[PDB]
Amino acid sequence: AVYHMTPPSGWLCNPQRPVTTHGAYQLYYLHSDQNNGPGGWDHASTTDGVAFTHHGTVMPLRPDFPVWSGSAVVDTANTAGFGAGAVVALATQPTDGVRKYQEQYLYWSTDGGFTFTALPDPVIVNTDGRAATTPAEIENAEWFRDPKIHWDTARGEWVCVIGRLRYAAFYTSPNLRDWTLRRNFDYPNHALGGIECPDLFEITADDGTRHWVLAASMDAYGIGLPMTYAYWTGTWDGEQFHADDLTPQWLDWGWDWYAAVTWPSIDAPETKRLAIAWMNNWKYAARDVPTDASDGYNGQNSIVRELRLARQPGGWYTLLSTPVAALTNYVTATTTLPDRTVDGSAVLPWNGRAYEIELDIAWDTATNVGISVGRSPDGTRHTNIGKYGADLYVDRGPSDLAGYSLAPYSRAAAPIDPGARSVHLRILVDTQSVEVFVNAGHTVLSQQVHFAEGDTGISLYTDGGPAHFTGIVVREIGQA
Numbered sequence: 001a002v003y004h005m006t007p008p009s010g011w012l013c014n015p016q017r018p019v020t021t022h023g024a025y026q027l028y029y030l031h032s033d034q035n036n037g038p039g040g041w042d043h044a045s046t047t048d049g050v051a052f053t054h055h056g057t058v059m060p061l062r063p064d065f066p067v068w069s070g071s072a073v074v075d076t077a078n079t080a081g082f083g084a085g086a087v088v089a090l091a092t093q094p095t096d097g098v099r100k101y102q103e104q105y106l107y108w109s110t111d112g113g114f115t116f117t118a119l120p121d122p123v124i125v126n127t128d129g130r131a132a133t134t135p136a137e138i139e140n141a142e143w144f145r146d147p148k149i150h151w152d153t154a155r156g157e158w159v160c161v162i163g164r165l166r167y168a169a170f171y172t173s174p175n176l177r178d179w180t181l182r183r184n185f186d187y188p189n190h191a192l193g194g195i196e197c198p199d200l201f202e203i204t205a206d207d208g209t210r211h212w213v214l215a216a217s218m219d220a221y222g223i224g225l226p227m228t229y230a231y232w233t234g235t236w237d238g239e240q241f242h243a244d245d246l247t248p249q250w251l252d253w254g255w256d257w258y259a260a261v262t263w264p265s266i267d268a269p270e271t272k273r274l275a276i277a278w279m280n281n282w283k284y285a286a287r288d289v290p291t292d293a294s295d296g297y298n299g300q301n302s303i304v305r306e307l308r309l310a311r312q313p314g315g316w317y318t319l320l321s322t323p324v325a326a327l328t329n330y331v332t333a334t335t336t337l338p339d340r341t342v343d344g345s346a347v348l349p350w351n352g353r354a355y356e357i358e359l360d361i362a363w364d365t366a367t368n369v370g371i372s373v374g375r376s377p378d379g380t381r382h383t384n385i386g387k388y389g390a391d392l393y394v395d396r397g398p399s400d401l402a403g404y405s406l407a408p409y410s411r412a413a414a415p416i417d418p419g420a421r422s423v424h425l426r427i428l429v430d431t432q433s434v435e436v437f438v439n440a441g442h443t444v445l446s447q448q449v450h451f452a453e454g455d456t457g458i459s460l461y462t463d464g465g466p467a468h469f470t471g472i473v474v475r476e477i478g479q480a
């Protein structure tokens with residue numbers, strides 16, 4: 001991967017929300033030496049959100065005692081008692097290796113998050129676990145993970161959300177150590193997802209109003225929805241979360257954008273947040289990928305995106321995504337191709353493996369318009385990005401790789417006004433991925449695609465009528 005974060009070696013999994021220390025963002029992520037094997041927390045720094053510097057393991061796997069997801073905060077006021085500016089983290093671990101005992105362990109660092117010391121006693125015990133007996137109770141006790149910590153400025157205390165089976169739990173605390181149980185957050189459509197890696201934060205919209213957001217990784221495949229990240233805007237009063245609407249909004253419509261996390265940007269912490277996700281899906285994550293045999297590592301994170309909250313008519317709010325601004329500094333060549341009308345198919349005179357392509361498509365009678373990336377000259381391999389019906393689709397089907405096939409999860413789609421007769425597309429292509437930012441970024445589709453060495457072409461296509469392809473610009477992205 002040219003511009004996507006990958007581990008030096010081993011298995012990459014869930015990223016942990018970054019903390020800001022030493023002028024950079026400190027990213028943590030689950031790492032294991034074996035694919036989908038037991039592991040812990042590794043460390044990587046980044047100052048711009050594009051290039052990362054790996055520092056190795058910081059919260060190691062212990063004998064039959066792995067480290068799962070959680071989060072970390074900079075105890076600036078020294079409320080935890082480990083010192084002013086101490087980086088305090090909570091992480092779920094299966095006590096005694098017992099899954100039904102998975103609970104929250106605290107770790108703290110005095111050097112900005114580079115080395116952590118462990119507090120032996122869990123700060124939030126899995127009481128249900130020890131009482132669980134029925135097959136229903138133990139299943140519940142086996143889903144009490146991923147603590148996301150947030151400082152509630154209004155009440156002056158810490159609030160923490162934990163993912164449970166088809167619901168989320170809340171706890172408050174004045175010192176990150178002693179937690180008081182609050183009311184749960186329930187939602188109607190359980191066919192959505194069971195809440196893993198929940199997110200909790202406050203953000204200011206373009207109209208100046210403050211809002212809370214509760215989100216989480218879901219699995220809504222069964223009902224035709226994504227298996228990525230969904231959020232509910234609302235408010236937290238210190239005892240329970242009030243969603244403005246119980247039907248959540250999605251942040252990505254692609255196949256691979258799981259365990260996503262968000263963090264405040266250094267330059268505008270209240271209005272602009274950064275986000276990054278693990279580009280993988282559990283439907284097939286536990287397996288060997290091309291990079292394993294060629295480089296000994298498995299997994300990459302998505303590009304870092306910027307998030308902002310925009311007011312909508314009717315008084316509701318939605319998030320908007322766009323590639324991290326600094327990516328522009330890694331552009332090594334900018335190629336513009338003349339506008340053109342195509343009726344059927346046409347191959348662009350450009351080839352590459354890591355780049356960003358922007359273009360507009362306007363049509364009338366055409367029922368299908370689109371662009372194909374990673375096109376092999378033998379004409380057999382390619383990934384299709386286009387508009388059909390009410391779908392803005394990304395079909396990685398013709399890019400399936402022998403022995404690493406992603407079937408049947410080939411065609412991802414985001415909703416788009418079927419009445420639209422034009423659309424703007426910003427597409428990021430890298431050696432093992434495709435990320436499509438549609439229009440103004442309200443809808444994004446992220447997916448891993450196993451491109452071959454010769455999958456470097458690009459072609460345009462329409463079905464049922466001509467389409468005008470304009471503003472075509474291709475930006476080659478480099479290592480630095």
Ligand SMILES: OC[C@H]1O[C@@](CO)(OC[C@H]2O[C@](O)(CO)[C@@H](O)[C@@H]2O)[C@@H](O)[C@@H]1O
Nearest residue numbers: 128140166167168169170181184185186
């Ligand atoms: O079975 C889960 C279901 O039960 C409710 C209450 O009706 O809460 C269960 C849950 O609340 C705790 O006390 C705290 O999170 C847990 O210990 C207990 O399992 C629902 O909210 C939930 O959907």
Ligand SMILES: OC[C@H]1O[C@@](CO)(OC[C@H]2O[C@](O)(CO)[C@@H](O)[C@@H]2O)[C@@H](O)[C@@H]1O
Nearest residue numbers: 344368384386388393395411461462463
């Ligand atoms: O290569 C372009 C050509 O392929 C067709 C069908 O053979 O469409 C491909 C493309 O459209 C969808 O079916 C829309 O849902 C995608 O899933 C699929 O990738 C032609 O329409 C097009 O001209």
